[PDB]
Design a protein around this ligand. Structure first.
Ligand SMILES: [K+]
Ligand SMILES: [K+]
Ligand SMILES: [K+]
Ligand SMILES: [K+]
Ligand SMILES: [K+]
Lengths: 92, 94
């Protein structure tokens, strides 16, 4: 599996399973319902501040949530970055 | 906890590589590299792919250095005490 999920869609499923609305989740974590709506739709990133608030509501660590976002962003780049012409200066 | 740009700067210094030469190698503008090295802009996912190609390790590693930096500015700052952890036992203040 090359394509991986935006963390918003994992959150959306957890909220569905718990019977928790986007608005109620936003009020619990202390952000606007508009922010949550965009996050759940995968239209905005799970930022460092959001990761702290989300870990407090859904568990694990802020680092976990951020890692999911980073992983999504890398795979979304697809073929955009040709690395074949980049000379290795370090060690790999 | 240093910004990852300043870690890169030290590596470039050790290799005798200017910021401009590094920018040309990784395929971005010297302005972008200059801002990164000064800690004035974030190490993004696209940059992490290019940087991993030039300096080694994985894109995820460079992104983790950036995340660590960002979270160190905030984990001591944001009050989570009002946030319910769903499914946990109700809080009981003594
Ligand atoms: K995979
Ligand atoms: K479910
Ligand atoms: K409310
Ligand atoms: K942490
Ligand atoms: K280093």
């Amino acid at each position: 599996q090359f394509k991986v999920s935006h963390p918003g869609e994992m959150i959306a499923r957890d909220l569905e399973d718990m019977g928790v609305s986007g608005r109620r989740f936003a009020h619990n974590i202390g952000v606007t319902p508009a922010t949550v709506s965009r996050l759940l739709a995968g239209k905005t990133a799970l930022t460092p501040s959001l990761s702290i608030r989300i870990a407090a509501a859904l568990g694990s660590t802020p680092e976990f949530w951020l890692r999911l976002q980073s992983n999504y962003d890398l795979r979304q780049l697809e073929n955009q970055i040709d690395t074949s012409g980049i000379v290795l200066y370090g060690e790999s």
